Amino acid sequence: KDPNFVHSGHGGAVAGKKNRTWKNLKQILASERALPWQLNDPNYF
Protein backbone atom coordinates (compact mmCIF):
# COMPACT_ATOMS: atom_id res chain seq x y z
CA LYS A 1 0.00 0.00 0.00
CA ASP A 2 3.09 2.18 0.36
CA PRO A 3 6.27 2.38 -1.76
CA ASN A 4 8.51 1.56 1.21
CA PHE A 5 8.15 0.74 4.91
CA VAL A 6 11.86 1.12 5.75
CA HIS A 7 12.05 4.91 5.42
CA SER A 8 15.19 6.25 7.10
CA GLY A 9 15.93 9.67 8.53
CA HIS A 10 18.08 12.14 6.60
CA GLY A 11 19.41 14.05 9.61
CA GLY A 12 16.36 14.77 11.74
CA ALA A 13 16.09 15.72 15.40
CA VAL A 14 15.03 12.32 16.76
CA ALA A 15 18.30 11.96 18.67
CA GLY A 16 19.20 15.59 19.41
CA LYS A 17 17.16 18.65 20.34
CA LYS A 18 17.51 20.52 17.04
CA ASN A 19 14.78 21.39 14.53
CA ARG A 20 12.68 18.32 13.77
CA THR A 21 12.11 19.17 10.11
CA TRP A 22 15.55 20.21 8.83
CA LYS A 23 18.20 22.91 9.14
CA ASN A 24 17.09 26.50 8.64
CA LEU A 25 17.52 28.09 5.22
CA LYS A 26 19.94 30.63 6.69
CA GLN A 27 21.94 27.76 8.19
CA ILE A 28 21.77 25.90 4.87
CA LEU A 29 23.25 28.85 2.99
CA ALA A 30 25.83 29.44 5.73
CA SER A 31 26.99 25.83 5.38
CA GLU A 32 26.95 26.01 1.57
CA ARG A 33 29.14 29.13 1.67
CA ALA A 34 31.96 26.96 3.07
CA LEU A 35 32.28 25.18 -0.29
CA PRO A 36 35.43 26.21 -2.24
CA TRP A 37 33.47 27.97 -4.97
CA GLN A 38 35.58 29.16 -7.88
CA LEU A 39 35.89 32.88 -8.59
CA ASN A 40 33.60 32.62 -11.63
CA ASP A 41 31.54 29.71 -10.29
CA PRO A 42 27.79 30.36 -10.02
CA ASN A 43 26.03 29.91 -6.69
CA TYR A 44 22.93 30.97 -4.76
CA PHE A 45 24.67 34.14 -3.50
Added chain:
DNA sequence: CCGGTGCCGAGGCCGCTCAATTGGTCGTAGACAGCTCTAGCACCGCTTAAACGCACGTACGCGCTGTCCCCCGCGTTTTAACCGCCAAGGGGATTACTCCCTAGTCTCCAGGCACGTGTCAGATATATACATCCTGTGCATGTACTCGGGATATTGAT
Protein backbone atom coordinates in the same frame (compact mmCIF):
# COMPACT_ATOMS: atom_id res chain seq x y z
C1' DC B 1 -12.64 150.91 58.24
C1' DC B 2 -10.03 147.59 53.97
C1' DG B 3 -6.38 146.83 50.78
C1' DG B 4 -1.60 147.32 48.33
C1' DT B 5 3.02 145.93 49.34
C1' DG B 6 7.55 144.82 51.62
C1' DC B 7 9.66 141.22 54.54
C1' DC B 8 10.30 136.67 55.93
C1' DG B 9 9.41 131.87 55.84
C1' DA B 10 9.00 127.62 53.24
C1' DG B 11 8.95 124.56 49.04
C1' DG B 12 10.94 123.37 44.72
C1' DC B 13 14.63 122.75 41.53
C1' DC B 14 19.30 121.54 40.14
C1' DG B 15 23.91 120.00 41.04
C1' DC B 16 28.12 118.01 42.96
C1' DT B 17 31.02 115.40 47.04
C1' DC B 18 31.80 111.65 49.20
C1' DA B 19 31.39 106.90 50.68
C1' DA B 20 30.31 101.94 49.29
C1' DT B 21 30.13 98.12 45.34
C1' DT B 22 32.00 94.57 41.41
C1' DG B 23 34.69 92.79 37.12
C1' DG B 24 39.66 92.68 35.50
C1' DT B 25 44.70 91.47 36.02
C1' DC B 26 48.76 89.29 38.23
C1' DG B 27 50.82 84.90 39.86
C1' DT B 28 52.09 80.41 41.42
C1' DA B 29 51.17 75.55 42.70
C1' DG B 30 49.01 71.26 43.42
C1' DA B 31 46.07 68.39 40.39
C1' DC B 32 43.56 66.98 35.63
C1' DA B 33 45.45 64.83 30.79
C1' DG B 34 48.31 61.38 29.33
C1' DC B 35 51.93 57.61 27.96
C1' DT B 36 54.09 52.92 29.93
C1' DC B 37 54.07 49.05 30.59
C1' DT B 38 51.81 45.05 32.79
C1' DA B 39 49.11 41.89 34.38
C1' DG B 40 46.75 39.00 34.72
C1' DC B 41 42.25 38.71 33.39
C1' DA B 42 37.95 39.47 32.20
C1' DC B 43 36.01 39.44 27.45
C1' DC B 44 35.51 37.25 23.14
C1' DG B 45 35.25 33.05 19.76
C1' DC B 46 34.09 28.65 19.41
C1' DT B 47 31.60 24.17 20.66
C1' DT B 48 27.59 21.41 22.75
C1' DA B 49 23.68 20.23 26.25
C1' DA B 50 19.54 20.73 28.38
C1' DA B 51 15.26 23.43 29.68
C1' DC B 52 12.51 26.90 29.79
C1' DG B 53 10.15 29.87 26.98
C1' DC B 54 6.63 29.89 23.63
C1' DA B 55 2.42 28.68 20.96
C1' DC B 56 -2.29 25.71 20.26
C1' DG B 57 -6.15 24.06 21.80
C1' DT B 58 -9.62 23.69 25.37
C1' DA B 59 -12.14 23.57 29.80
C1' DC B 60 -14.50 26.89 32.98
C1' DG B 61 -15.53 30.71 35.96
C1' DC B 62 -15.64 35.87 36.86
C1' DG B 63 -16.53 40.24 34.66
C1' DC B 64 -20.31 43.12 31.67
C1' DT B 65 -24.85 43.21 30.70
C1' DG B 66 -30.30 44.21 31.80
C1' DT B 67 -34.70 45.49 35.64
C1' DC B 68 -37.53 47.86 40.68
C1' DC B 69 -37.02 51.09 45.22
C1' DC B 70 -36.05 54.05 48.45
C1' DC B 71 -31.73 56.57 50.77
C1' DC B 72 -28.68 59.86 50.09
C1' DG B 73 -27.67 64.06 47.53
C1' DC B 74 -29.43 68.72 46.09
C1' DG B 75 -31.26 73.11 47.22
C1' DT B 76 -33.31 76.36 50.17
C1' DT B 77 -33.68 79.13 54.46
C1' DT B 78 -31.75 81.87 58.66
C1' DT B 79 -28.16 83.25 61.70
C1' DA B 80 -23.55 83.33 64.40
C1' DA B 81 -19.16 82.32 65.64
C1' DC B 82 -15.14 82.96 63.02
C1' DC B 83 -12.02 85.23 59.71
C1' DG B 84 -9.62 89.25 58.66
C1' DC B 85 -8.23 93.82 59.48
C1' DC B 86 -6.42 97.39 62.54
C1' DA B 87 -3.82 99.30 66.42
C1' DA B 88 -0.83 99.76 70.46
C1' DG B 89 2.52 98.00 74.30
C1' DG B 90 6.97 95.93 74.94
C1' DG B 91 10.25 92.45 74.91
C1' DG B 92 14.19 90.35 72.40
C1' DA B 93 16.58 89.25 68.75
C1' DT B 94 19.73 92.21 66.02
C1' DT B 95 23.99 94.63 65.18
C1' DA B 96 28.34 96.18 66.40
C1' DC B 97 32.48 96.23 69.33
C1' DT B 98 36.58 94.18 72.29
C1' DC B 99 38.66 90.08 74.14
C1' DC B 100 39.68 85.26 74.60
C1' DC B 101 40.60 80.44 72.62
C1' DT B 102 40.48 76.68 70.43
C1' DA B 103 40.19 75.30 65.10
C1' DG B 104 43.62 74.82 61.65
C1' DT B 105 48.25 73.93 59.81
C1' DC B 106 52.23 70.60 59.65
C1' DT B 107 55.36 68.11 61.78
C1' DC B 108 56.94 64.01 64.02
C1' DC B 109 56.23 59.41 65.81
C1' DA B 110 54.59 54.44 66.00
C1' DG B 111 52.14 50.69 66.96
C1' DG B 112 47.14 48.54 65.73
C1' DC B 113 44.51 46.45 62.46
C1' DA B 114 43.04 46.59 57.11
C1' DC B 115 44.42 43.34 53.65
C1' DG B 116 46.15 39.85 50.93
C1' DT B 117 47.71 34.82 50.34
C1' DG B 118 48.13 29.72 51.49
C1' DT B 119 46.11 25.49 53.59
C1' DC B 120 42.62 22.14 54.25
C1' DA B 121 38.05 20.21 55.87
C1' DG B 122 33.32 20.14 56.75
C1' DA B 123 29.15 22.33 55.57
C1' DT B 124 26.13 22.36 51.49
C1' DA B 125 24.39 21.35 46.58
C1' DT B 126 22.40 17.26 44.41
C1' DA B 127 20.02 12.74 43.10
C1' DT B 128 16.66 9.12 44.57
C1' DA B 129 13.34 6.51 47.20
C1' DC B 130 10.06 7.18 51.00
C1' DA B 131 5.78 9.11 53.17
C1' DT B 132 2.78 12.25 55.50
C1' DC B 133 1.37 17.14 56.17
C1' DC B 134 -1.14 20.55 54.06
C1' DT B 135 -5.02 21.61 50.84
C1' DG B 136 -9.56 21.54 48.10
C1' DT B 137 -14.22 19.89 49.20
C1' DG B 138 -18.20 19.30 51.91
C1' DC B 139 -21.21 20.44 55.77
C1' DA B 140 -23.20 21.39 60.93
C1' DT B 141 -24.19 25.37 63.83
C1' DG B 142 -23.44 29.78 66.43
C1' DT B 143 -21.39 34.26 66.92
C1' DA B 144 -22.73 38.26 65.22
C1' DC B 145 -25.67 41.76 62.38
C1' DT B 146 -30.35 43.63 62.60
C1' DC B 147 -34.86 45.39 64.43
C1' DG B 148 -37.52 47.22 68.30
C1' DG B 149 -38.29 49.24 72.78
C1' DG B 150 -36.82 51.10 77.27
C1' DA B 151 -32.60 53.15 80.35
C1' DT B 152 -29.05 57.15 80.71
C1' DA B 153 -26.95 60.85 79.36
C1' DT B 154 -26.39 65.36 76.56
C1' DT B 155 -27.24 69.64 74.89
C1' DG B 156 -29.81 74.46 74.52
C1' DA B 157 -33.20 78.31 76.32
C1' DT B 158 -35.24 80.75 80.38
